[PDB]
Structure formats: structure tokens, C-alpha cells
Design a protein around this ligand. Structure first.
Ligand code: CLA
Ligand code: CLA
Ligand code: CLA
Ligand code: CLA
Ligand code: CLA
Ligand code: CLA
Ligand code: CLA
Ligand code: CLA
Ligand code: KC1
Ligand SMILES: CC1=C(/C=C/C(C)=C/C=C/C(C)=C/C=C/C=C(C)/C=C/C=C(C)/C=C/C2=C(C)CCCC2(C)C)C(C)(C)CCC1
Lengths: 168, 165, 160, 253, 160
């Protein structure tokens, strides 16, 4: 009836939030699993990006780095991508992880049904129903919110420099 | 605890959100609860009007008092009111008193809806399911929610002023 | 009032002077409420006295208009003054919302303590009661601990 | 359904588009749609195209057909049929209870309330229509409690009250905004002019009572227009009284 | 109503201005509740004036942070501005809780002056009327004495 996926749920004002104006679910239901995988991956990457905007301001990691001005995150990409360096290695690592995703799904995304979208092995879902639902909706909400947030940072702390947690 | 059925799902965060956290509804007859709703709606309408008056006084739209004072009146609505002559203030008091008299002695409000001072319940039908555009309960809730919000907003304006400037 | 929360291993009848009528169901429900509340507030207060000194105070401003970097505020007690009244008012409005959102009138599910903060949202398992008991025991310990810490920094400078 | 609306290829029209066209078209309209209707062109293209009929068409004719036929969504969407059904139910209901719009900034803005525009007593009466300005309880008890209509008032009381109101009003526009504005006797001249206006309108009311004899206020027996004439005479008396009171309040204070 | 606790003996049903004609009951019931509460407060306040005069101002500091030895606060009018606004807020909160406790809503056991003190519960020895009527008569007398005392305190200038 609905998108079938978990989504929505635990929404403010009570009830559920089925928000889908363009109706990408109804118009293209075959790519609904692809949409869920994209949403989950984008949310996870955005949350990791928020963590990578915050923590390097604090710790600055072992090895060479450790500099100071190489944390502006409007600049840090170019140094570690130049000279065939750490950014390339991270690209290779992400490619390998998503190759594992290919293998689990079965190449060409011949899997990707509406239960394994984002399941991505790794962590184990809680077998309890209400826990599972609350935890999944928490992941989805934190995901989308960090996507919108990280986008806001990568616009604002670019037009007005800032480049530190206040971003204002 | 549920609504006293004379209010009957007419407010709260949601429409059916009987919210009283003080026992101001229990063991009270229907007339008293109707009085509470009439007082809430009158306070609201007064507030909702007062907020607009404040924001149109604090935005420079302060004629009729620009002419009375024969000089630009203060944008601060409290100081603008203080600038008014006692003749004008007591004219306002007398007009509000005449309005309150109108809705009590010659034009008493309906017994089952004391907030309906205009007596709008004698020309409107109701919200019914046959009506695709039935929104009378919706506009009642709009009035109530904006009333409750403006009641605290006008106090925020008044107490924020005269204590902070 | 036998199988609720307080019963545990060392004690579980600890009431030298309370249970005045040994009845007053409403009184005991209100008392379990204040128990859960005071417990939660004491735990948050003990953490806010525990997170500053080890894993040192946050880096930032907390009031960029008035330049009140998180660290320079005194750890214990004395923070009640230097943190601006704007921030204190916002703390108070958060507390007022958190209490007045769900109905605290006795009888309601929020009256007995369930505020709808089901993080683990234990789906009524056997885990429910043991989580409740751990919460209430740590609540009592936290109340004692924060009274001790408040006394300590009331008699000796900062929190220690 | 009709034989020609069966197994129509999606190229000519969508299945949802065909269903919407049928929904928005009256049932008796089928089998012979009018030349200007969508169903007629849909029928004309339903034959000569599909199944054993012609399966291909030239590009220009395809463009013609696409221009002349609906495309389901945003033209024959289910929401559009819902809105049309709502509109027809509205027009059915307005023969009865009418929704209340108000012209705001020159465009009618729906309020959310629906009136009882249908008259209470006489359906075809042109002045028994119901409006909040003329049929709400405030209007009924406001006009009904005025001196001209208030219960328990003798004719002289109505005249006196109306006259006091008129006389107190009329002193205003004469003391200021007059020939002798900036004079010490501005209030007195205004009072004299207000009394003159009250007398003139009272003579006019006497003329009306002598000619028309309204008879709306006469008690039992009596004569036609006695009540109205008494009302006008006491209106003159009250006008003098109210004008004098206004002049008194101007000279004092 | 012509037989309630109020009618003592020196004056009978003393209602000179006719507040009882067509006894509205509920009106009389709530006016009796107001009389009881006002009398109790008047007794407490008459204590709060005549005891600090003979008995010295409290041995103590009142406000530990703003040097109130109870000797800089004079007994009588003017102490309204001497006692801290926070102290006034706290005594106000005490009274507010004492009333926002057991309800005194119309018809409730709190609506007839009964609250649950029971300091003198004489064992029904034809003396429940004795204590009730004594409380009411002393309430009237203490309200009048309070009015006279405040008029002396302000008119003369201070204390008595
Ligand atoms: C990468 C972005 C992205 C993607 C792929 C999705 C994907 C999805 N969202 Mg979603 N969402 C996002 C961002 C995204 N979201 C953000 C930022 C918000 C915050 C406003 C939301 C808020 C939201 C709600 C409240 C709900 C969804 C729902 C859904 C699912 C069904 C709707 C649909 O097909 O939309 C796909 C849309 C696109 C592919 C558009 C891409 C962005 C354009 C190009 C701009 C689907 C899995 C629904 C759901 O899961 O219900 C079961 C639902 O109720 N989303
Ligand atoms: C979680 C969502 C979120 C929040 C809370 C804020 C919050 C704020 N934004 Mg913002 N913003 C967001 C998302 C968000 N933004 C997104 C997704 C974009 C991309 C279009 C922007 C682009 C943006 C601009 C361009 C500006 C803000 C500005 C601001 C500030 C006013 C305020 C702190 C203003 C500011 O001064 O920030 C530096 C400002 O001019 N925002
Ligand atoms: C609770 C409602 C309320 C109250 C108590 C006041 C009170 C006041 N207003 Mg005011 N005002 C209000 C609502 C209110 N207003 C609203 C809703 C509007 C928007 C139309 C205005 C627009 C308005 C203007 C433009 C001016 C005032 C002015 C004044 C002051 C002189 C009285 C006067 O001439 O009023 C005149 C009021 C009107 C012409 C609007 C009547 C509309 C009523 C509320 C509908 C019922 C006085 C302090 C005047 C002044 O000099 O302030 C110091 C002035 O210039 N008000
Ligand atoms: C155009 C001039 C004019 C006219 C036609 C009338 C007409 C009338 N006056 Mg009149 N009146 C006028 C000017 C006028 N008045 C002025 C200027 C004064 C002030 C001196 C008065 C003072 C006045 C009094 C004191 C009385 C009238 C009365 C009357 C009525 C007889 C009649 C309706 C009498 C009346 O009330 O009739 C019922 C009456 O007793 N008039
Ligand atoms: C309560 C009754 C009353 C009182 C006390 C006064 C009082 C006064 N009138 Mg007056 N007056 C009244 C009714 C009254 N008027 C009425 C009803 C009329 C209409 C006929 C007038 C017509 C009137 C005139 C035409 C004049 C006064 C004048 C005066 C003043 C002398 C004095 C202030 C005189 C004046 O202007 O004094 C300054 C004056 O010339 N009065
Ligand atoms: C506010 C205090 C208060 C209240 C609520 C009552 C209430 C009552 N009294 Mg009571 N009484 C009071 C004070 C009060 N009394 C005092 C001070 C005295 C001593 C003089 C008495 C002596 C008294 C007697 C002897 C009797 C009653 C009786 C009654 C009952 C019936 C009379 C009635 O309806 O009074 C209604 C309540 C009032 C009228 C209180 C209004 C007081 C006005 C507002 C002020 C009076 C002047 C004041 C001193 C002005 C001070 C200045 C101020 C403006 C700042 C009723 C329950 C009768 C009874 O019990 O019958 C069964 C009865 O026989 N009273
Ligand atoms: C003249 C002094 C005087 C007298 C005779 C009484 C007498 C009484 N008081 Mg009382 N009281 C007084 C001063 C006095 N009080 C003062 C100064 C205060 C303020 C602290 C109070 C506050 C007070 C409260 C709060 C209550 C009483 C109650 C009672 C009654 C006891 C219970 C009982 O018999 O109910 C029948 C058994 C009894 C009639 C109680 C009462 O009426 O109901 C239990 C009650 O709840 N009194
Ligand atoms: C039974 C109550 C009572 C008693 C014994 C006294 C006793 C006294 N009053 Mg008194 N008084 C009282 C109630 C009382 N007052 C009340 C209720 C009022 C307010 C109406 C006053 C108003 C009052 C004034 C205005 C004056 C006294 C004065 C006096 C003294 C003479 C004497 C000490 C006089 C005094 O001491 O002079 C300062 C004086 O002038 N009284
Ligand atoms: C200014 C831009 C804006 C923001 C920033 C914003 C934010 C959020 N909206 Mg919102 N919204 C609008 C605009 C904005 N919304 C508009 C114009 C409408 C009218 C069409 C509208 C309607 C709803 C409804 C019906 C729901 C809703 C939701 C949430 C939600 C989830 C919170 C939570 O559940 O985690 C968040 C964070 C759900 C909810 O109720 O939140 C209380 C939900 O059901 N919204
Ligand atoms: C503003 C407003 C309004 C209103 C209006 C109006 C309508 C007004 C009017 C007003 C008026 C219009 C008033 C009047 C008054 C009057 C008077 C006040 C009079 C008096 C008189 C007298 C007192 C007389 C006496 C006498 C006699 C009787 C005879 C003999 C002589 C003598 C003098 C003794 C409305 C609501 C619409 C709305 C808006 C606002």
C-alpha cells in the first residue's frame, strides 16, 4: 500500500509521514529499492561527513597530517588527493566495500529487493520488532537530517569561510 | 481523563488533545465550561487584534494619534498609548464598555455558545459530511489556536517592553 | 505495593518512617513519580559534574555575543551565575516543555514515569523490569551522589 | 462498456486517461458524443486504429491526435474527477445552503463557513434571504432593540430616544465645519443649525405621516398614522433636547 | 441560613447589609470558606506582629547571601520591601502549594474550612461546635484587630 519500506514512522504530530510529493515510489516502483539504497547510503555518508567535519577539528589523526591549516575541509580534499595519496586509497577502499555489496547482491544489482536495501551485512539488526523499527527510523531520520545539514555546512561555511563547528 | 464533552475536542496540540494540567475542568457544570471557552475566545480575539495593533504601531503606521499628538507618535506601542490623552483612553474604555453592554443586555450571546457574540450560529448550518468544503470546525480551531498563541504573544510584547525598553 | 522497582538484593523494604498509612495508593504513585524524576535529574547532574573534570570541558563559545567559552565557566555550583540568563531561561523553557508536553496529572501513563522516551523501546519483555530496577537503583545512588557533590563544592571551592 | 472502447492501444490514449474521460462524461452522452467533446475525438480515433484496423499512422497525423487527445495525468487525473464531483455537489447544495466567500482584494476568498441563504419562511421572497449582517442573532437583537423596534417602548419613548441621538449628532458638523467656525458663538450657531435641521426633518416626518400614514406603530383603534406622527413629534422634542445637551457639553468642559 | 457556626450570642444573625436574603447557599458556603481562611490568616498575622515585638527578631541570618539579621527588617508595614523578593516568592509558593493541595473546590471537604489539621479534635464532647465557633469568632476578632493594628502601624508610622 505504502512504499513498503520502513521509512516514515515515529513521526511528529503523531501518526506517520508518507511524504513523497513527486511520487517517485508510485511512478517508478521497480527502482524503489534503488531509492532506498541511495537514501541510506547518502545518509550514512552524510553522518560520517559531519563526524569528519567535527573530529578533525579536535584530534587531527596520526601520521604526517597534524598540521593546522589542513583542516579547513574546503582545502583538505586536494592535499590528500594530490600525489596519488590517501584520498585515492580511500576511493579504492570504498570501491572494495561496494564490490562486496555487488557480490552480496549478485552483480548488476540483480538483488536489491525491499528488505536488503542498505542491509549491507556488517551490523546486525535487532530481532525485537519495536526496537528494530525505532532504530531503523532513527537511522533514516538522522541520515536525512545529516544530509540536509552537511549540505547546509558545505554551502554556508564556504560562502562565509567559517570552517569550524559554529559555522556561523 | 477526557474532555467534558461541552468543549469536546476543541483544542490542545491536536484537536482532540484535552490538555488541562490543573483540574480546572473537573466537577464543573456545562455553563461554567462554556464560560471558560467564551473567556478564552474573548481574550484571544482581543489578543489577536492587539498583536496586529502592536505590530502596526511598531512599524510606523501610527496615524490618528500622529494627528492627535500633532507630532510623530512613538513607535513603541506602550509609549504611544501613554502619549494619548486621558480623553482618548477613556473614549476607548467607553467604547469597549458599550460593546460589552451590546453583547449582554440587548444582544445576549447564545446560551450554548456564549463566545458567539455576533450570533453567527443562527445563519451557519454546521460541518456536515455531505459538504465537500466543510471547514467550520477547522476555522473554529484556527481561531482557537491563533487565539491561544496571540494571548501569550501579546504578553510577551507587553512584559518584554516596560522591562527591557 | 510489593513488586515494583524498589525490591532488590540488599534491601527492598527500606522505609523507616514512610508509608505513613501503609496505603494511600495515590501517594505511592506520586512517590514513584518523584522517584523516577529525581533519579533522572540526579543522574544528568552527576554526569554534568563528571564529564567536565575528566574529558575536559567543551571547546567553543556558548555565547558568541558575550564570549563565554565553555571551558572558562566554573565546573560546580558557581556556573549558576556566569552562564547568561538567556541560556538559563532556555534551559528552563526546555524543562517546562519536557514536563508539560505529556500530562503529569496522576493516573496518566506519564504520571507513573513513562514519558515516551523509549530509546531502547523494550517491547514489554522480561528485560523491562530489570532495566527499570537498574534505572531506579542508579537514580537513588545518583541522588545521594549529587547531594554529596553539591555539599562538597559548597564547602570546598569547585566540585572537588 | 461500448465495443469501440475495448482494447484501445495505449498509443491512442492511456487506460487511466480513457477511464477519466468516461468518468467526466455523462453516461447518456456515450454512443453519440457531440462534435466538440473529448469523447467524440476519442471515439473517432478509437476506430481506424487498433486491433485489426490500421496499426500505423503518419507522424503529422500522430501529432494531430496527440494534440487532440488527453494525456491522463494533470488533464484527466482522478483528482480532477474528484474536484468536478465536488463542484457538482457544491452546486447541488447551493440550491439550499451556500458556501460563504468574501471578496478580499477584489477576489472572492473562501472563509470556511456555509450560509443558510435559503429564506426561512418564503422560498421565493426576494427580501427574506438570510445573511449574517441581516439575520445573525446580533443583527436581530440589535435592530430589534433599537428605539424604532424595542419592545415595551411607547411611541413617545421611541421618538424621544431617536431625537436625542439625532440632535446630539447634528450639533457636531455645524459648530466646526461651518461659516462661523472660529468664533466664540460657534457652539451656539451649531446648536441653532442642528435645531433647524431637526425641525426640518420633523416637518418632513409629519408630512410623511399625513400623506402615507405608515400605520406600523398605531395602537388598537386610533387612526392611521397616529403612532408614526407621535414618534415624529417626540423625535422633534428629543432632537431639541439632544442638541441642547450637546451645546451644554460644548460650552462646559 | 440562621443556625450555622457564626451565630455566637452577643449578636445573633448579624447581616446588617442583607447578604443572606434569598440565601444563595453556594454563595454563603464560599463566603463562609473565605471567612474561615481569612480568619486563620489573620490569626497567623497577628501572631506575626505581636510575637516579634516581645520575642526578639529571629536569632539567625534569614538570607545567607544578603545579610538579613532579622533586625534590619522592622515589624510592621515596610517589611514587604525588606524581606527578599525571593523570600516573598517562596512564602507565596508555600501558601500556593498548601491550597493547591487537597482541593477546596465547591462541595469538596476543603470548601468548608476542613483541611486536616486536627490539632484539637475533642472526642465529640459537645465541643466540635465549641472549637469551630471559637475559631470563627477569633477569626472575626483577629481580622478586626489586624485592621486596627495595620492602621496603627501605618498611621502612627511604625509597629504600634
Ligand atoms: C538521496 C536522497 C534521498 C533519497 C534517494 C530518498 C529516498 C526515499 N525517501 Mg526520502 N528524504 C530525503 C532524501 C532522500 N530520500 C531527505 C533529505 C528528506 C528530508 C526532507 C527525506 C524525507 C523523506 C520522508 C519523510 C519519506 C521519504 C521516503 C522515501 C522513500 C520513498 C520516496 C521516494 O521514492 O523518494 C525518492 C526521491 C528521490 C530519488 C528524489 C531525489 C532528490 C531530487 C532529485 C531532488 C525513498 C526510499 C518515504 C518513505 O521511506 O516511506 C516509506 C517517506 O515517507 N523521504
Ligand atoms: C539542518 C538544516 C539547516 C539548519 C538548521 C540551518 C541553519 C542556518 N542556516 Mg542554512 N542551509 C541548509 C540547512 C540548514 N541551515 C541547507 C540544506 C542549505 C543549502 C541550500 C543551507 C544554506 C544556507 C545559506 C546560504 C545561508 C544559511 C544560513 C543559516 C543560518 C541562518 C542558520 C544557522 C545563513 C547564514 O548566515 O549561514 C552562514 C545563510 O545565508 N543556510
Ligand atoms: C486589542 C485591540 C486593539 C487595541 C486595544 C488598540 C489600541 C490602540 N490603537 Mg490599534 N489597531 C488594532 C487593534 C487594537 N488597537 C488592529 C487590529 C489594527 C489594524 C487595523 C490597529 C491599527 C491601528 C492604527 C493604524 C492606529 C492604532 C492606534 C491605536 C491607539 C489609539 C486608539 C485608536 O485610534 O485606535 C484606532 C484603531 C483603528 C483605526 C483600528 C480599528 C480596528 C479594530 C481593532 C477592529 C475591531 C490605541 C493604543 C492609533 C495610534 O495613534 O496609536 C497610538 C493608530 O494610528 N491602531
Ligand atoms: C428651518 C427652521 C426651522 C423649522 C422648520 C423648525 C420646525 C419646527 N420646530 Mg423649531 N427651531 C429652530 C428652527 C426650525 N424649527 C431653531 C433655529 C430653534 C432654536 C431657537 C428652534 C427651536 C424650537 C423649539 C424650542 C421648539 C421647536 C418646535 C418645532 C416644531 C413645531 C417644528 C417641527 C417645537 C416642537 O418641539 O414641536 C414638536 C418646539 O417646542 N423649535
Ligand atoms: C438641561 C438643560 C439645559 C441646560 C442646563 C442648558 C444650559 C445653557 N444653555 Mg441651553 N438649551 C437647551 C438645554 C439646556 N441648556 C435646549 C434643550 C435647547 C434647545 C431649545 C437650548 C438652547 C439654547 C440656546 C439657543 C442658548 C442656550 C444657552 C445656554 C447657556 C446659558 C447654558 C450653558 C445660551 C448660550 O449659548 O450660552 C452660552 C444660548 O444662547 N441654550
Ligand atoms: C471578608 C471577611 C468575611 C467574610 C467573607 C464573612 C462572611 C460571613 N459572615 Mg462575617 N464577619 C467578618 C468578616 C467576614 N464575614 C468580620 C470581620 C466580623 C466582625 C465584625 C464578622 C462578623 C459576623 C457575624 C457576627 C456574623 C457573620 C456572618 C457571616 C455569614 C453571613 C453574612 C454574609 O453573607 O457575609 C458576607 C461577607 C461579607 C459581607 C464580607 C464583605 C466585607 C466588606 C467587603 C468590607 C467591610 C468593611 C471593611 C472593614 C472595610 C475595610 C477597608 C477596605 C476597603 C480596605 C458569612 C459566611 C453571620 C453568620 O455566620 O451567619 C450564619 C453572623 O451572624 N459575620
Ligand atoms: C481560636 C483558635 C482556633 C480554634 C478554636 C481552632 C479549631 C479548629 N481548627 Mg483551626 N486554625 C487556627 C486556630 C484555631 N483553630 C489557626 C490560627 C490556623 C492557621 C494555622 C488554623 C488552621 C486550621 C486548619 C488548616 C484546620 C483547622 C482545623 C480545626 C478544627 C480541628 C479539627 C476538627 O475538630 O474537625 C472535626 C474533627 C477545629 C474546629 C481543621 C478542620 O477544621 O478540619 C479538620 C483543619 O483542617 N485549623
Ligand atoms: C477592637 C479593635 C481596636 C482597638 C482596641 C483599637 C484601639 C485604639 N485605636 Mg483603633 N482602629 C481600629 C481598631 C481598633 N483600635 C480599626 C479597625 C480602625 C480602622 C477603621 C482603627 C482606626 C483608628 C484611628 C484612625 C485611630 C485609632 C486610635 C486608637 C487608640 C485610641 C487605641 C489604641 C487612635 C490613635 O491611636 O491615634 C493614632 C486614632 O487616631 N484607631
Ligand atoms: C520550513 C521548512 C520545513 C521544515 C524545516 C520542516 C521540518 C520537518 N517537518 Mg515539515 N512541513 C513544512 C515545512 C517544513 N517542515 C510544510 C510547508 C508543511 C506543510 C505541507 C509541512 C508539513 C509537515 C508534516 C505533515 C510533517 C512534517 C514533518 C517534519 C519533520 C519531522 C520531524 C520528525 O518527525 O522527526 C521535520 C523536521 C513531520 C512532523 O510532523 O514533524 C513535526 C510530518 O509528519 N512536516
Ligand atoms: C464610533 C463607532 C461606531 C458608532 C458610531 C455611532 C452610531 C456613534 C453615535 C453616537 C451618538 C449619536 C451618541 C449620542 C448621544 C446622545 C446623547 C448623549 C443625548 C442626550 C440628550 C439629552 C440628555 C437630552 C435631554 C433633554 C431632553 C430629553 C428634552 C428636554 C431637554 C433636555 C436637555 C433635558 C460603530 C459602532 C458604528 C463602529 C465604529 C466605531
Amino acid at each position: 500500500f505504502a512504499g513498503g519500506l520502513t521509512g516514515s514512522d515515529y513521526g511528529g504530530f503523531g501518526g506517520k509521514y508518507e511524504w513523497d510529493p513527486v511520487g517517485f515510489s508510485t511512478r517508478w516502483p521497480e527502482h524503489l529499492a534503488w531509492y532506498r539504497e541511495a537514501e541510506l547510503k547518502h545518509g550514512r555518508i552524510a553522518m560520517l561527513a559531519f563526524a569528519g567535519l567535527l573530529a578533525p577539528d579536535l584530534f587531527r589523526l596520526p601520521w604526517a597530517e597534524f598540521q593546522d591549516s589542513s583542516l579547513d575541509f574546503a582545502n583538505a580534499h586536494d592535499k590528500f588527493v594530490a600525489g596519488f595519496g590517501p584520498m585515492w586509497w580511500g576511493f579504492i577502499a570504498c570501491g572494495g566495500i561496494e564490490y562486496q555489496r555487488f557480490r552480496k547482491l549478485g552483480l548488476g544489482m540483480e538483488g536489491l529487493t525491499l528488505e536488503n536495501a542498505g542491509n549491507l551485512g556488517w551490523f546486525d539488526l535487532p530481532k525485537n520488532s519495536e526496537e528494530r523499527l525505532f532504530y531503523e527510523t532513527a537511522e533514516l531520520k538522522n541520515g536525512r537530517l545529516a544530509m540536509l545539514a552537511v549540505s547546509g555546512i558545505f554551502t554556508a561555511g564556504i560562502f562565509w569561510d567559517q570552517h569550524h563547528f559554529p559555522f556561523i | 481523563r477526557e474532555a467534558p464533552k461541552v468543549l469536546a475536542g476543541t483544542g490542545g496540540p491536536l484537536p482532540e488533545s484535552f490538555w488541562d494540567p490543573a483540574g480546572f475542568t473537573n466537577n464543573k457544570t456545562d455553563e461554567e465550561l462554556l464560560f471558560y471557552r467564551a473567556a478564552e475566545l474573548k481574550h484571544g480575539r482581543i489578543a489577536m487584534a492587539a498583536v496586529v495593533g502592536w505590530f502596526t504601531n511598531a512599524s510606523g503606521f501610527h496615524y490618528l494619534g500622529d494627528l492627535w499628538l500633532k507630532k510623530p507618535a512613538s513607535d513603541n506601542p506602550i509609549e504611544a498609548f501613554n502619549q494619548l490623552s486621558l480623553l482618548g483612553v477613556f473614549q476607548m474604555v467607553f467604547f469597549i464598555g458599550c460593546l460589552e453592554w451590546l453583547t449582554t443586555v440587548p444582544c445576549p450571546p447564545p446560551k450554548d455558545a456564549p463566545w458567539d457574540v455576533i450570533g453567527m450560529s443562527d445563519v451557519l448550518e454546521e460541518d456536515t459530511d455531505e459538504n465537500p468544503m466543510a471547514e467550520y470546525k477547522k476555522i473554529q480551531m484556527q481561531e482557537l489556536n491563533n487565539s491561544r498563541l496571540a494571548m501569550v504573544a501579546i504578553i510577551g510584547l507587553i512584559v518584554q517592553a516596560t522591562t527591557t525598553g | 505495593f510489593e513488586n515494583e522497582l524498589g525490591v532488590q538484593a540488599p534491601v527492598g523494604f527500606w522505609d523507616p518512617v514512610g508509608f505513613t498509612a501503609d496505603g494511600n495508593v495515590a501517594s505511592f504513585r506520586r512517590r514513584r513519580t518523584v522517584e523516577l524524576k529525581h533519579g533522572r535529574i540526579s543522574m544528568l547532574a552527576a554526569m554534568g559534574y563528571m564529564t567536565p573534570e575528566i574529558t575536559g570541558k567543551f571547546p567553543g563559545y556558548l555565547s558568541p555575543s558575550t564570549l563565554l567559552k565553555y571551558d572558562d565557566i566554573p565546573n560546580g555550583l558557581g556556573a549558576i551565575s556566569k552562564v547568561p540568563a538567556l541560556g538559563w531561561a532556555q534551559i528552563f523553557v526546555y524543562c517546562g516543555y519536557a514536563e508539560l508536553s505529556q500530562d503529569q496529572t496522576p493516573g496518566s501513563p506519564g504520571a507513573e514515569g513513562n514519558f515516551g522516551f523509549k530509546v531502547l523501546t523494550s517491547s514489554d519483555p522480561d528485560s523491562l523490569e530489570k532495566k527499570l530496577a537498574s534505572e531506579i537503583a542508579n537514580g537513588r545512588l545518583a541522588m545521594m551522589a549529587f547531594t554529596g557533590m553539591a555539599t562538597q563544592d559548597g564547602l570546598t571551592g569547585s566540585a572537588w | 462498456v461500448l465495443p469501440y472502447m475495448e482494447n484501445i492501444p495505449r498509443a491512442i490514449v492511456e487506460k487511466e486517461a480513457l477511464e477519466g474521460v468516461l468518468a467526466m462524461t455523462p453516461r447518456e452522452q456515450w454512443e453519440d458524443p457531440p462534435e466538440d467533446s473529448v469523447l467524440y475525438t476519442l471515439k473517432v480515433y478509437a476506430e481506424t486504429y487498433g486491433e485489426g484496423k490500421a496499426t500505423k499512422m503518419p507522424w503529422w497525423d500522430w501529432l494531430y491526435m496527440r494534440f487532440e487527445l488527453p494525456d491522463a495525468n494533470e488533464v484527466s487525473a482522478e483528482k480532477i474527477k474528484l474536484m468536478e464531483d465536488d463542484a457538482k455537489i457544491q452546486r447541488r447544495m447551493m440550491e439550499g445552503k451556500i458556501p460563504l466567500y468574501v471578496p478580499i482584494l477584489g477576489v472572492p476568498i473562501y472563509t470556511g463557513m456555509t450560509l443558510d441563504w435559503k429564506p426561512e419562511a418564503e422560498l421565493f421572497a426576494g427580501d427574506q434571504i438570510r445573511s449574517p449582517i441581516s439575520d445573525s442573532r446580533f443583527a436581530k437583537n440589535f435592530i430589534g432593540n433599537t428605539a424604532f423596534y424595542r419592545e415595551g417602548l411607547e411611541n413617545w419613548q421611541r421618538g424621544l430616544e431617536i431625537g436625542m441621538a439625532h440632535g446630539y449628532f447634528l450639533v457636531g458638523p455645524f459648530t466646526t465645519l461651518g461659516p462661523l467656525r472660529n468664533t466664540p458663538e460657534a457652539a451656539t450657531v451649531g446648536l441653532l443649525s442642528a435645531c433647524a435641521v431637526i425641525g426640518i426633518v420633523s416637518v418632513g416626518g409629519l408630512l410623511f405621516g399625513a400623506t402615507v400614514k405608515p400605520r406600523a406603530f398605531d395602537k388598537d383603534g386610533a387612526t392611521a398614522g397616529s403612532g408614526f406622527t407621535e414618534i415624529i413629534n417626540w423625535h422633534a422634542v428629543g432632537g431639541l433636547g439632544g442638541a441642547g445637551f450637546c451645546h451644554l457639553l460644548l460650552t462646559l468642559f
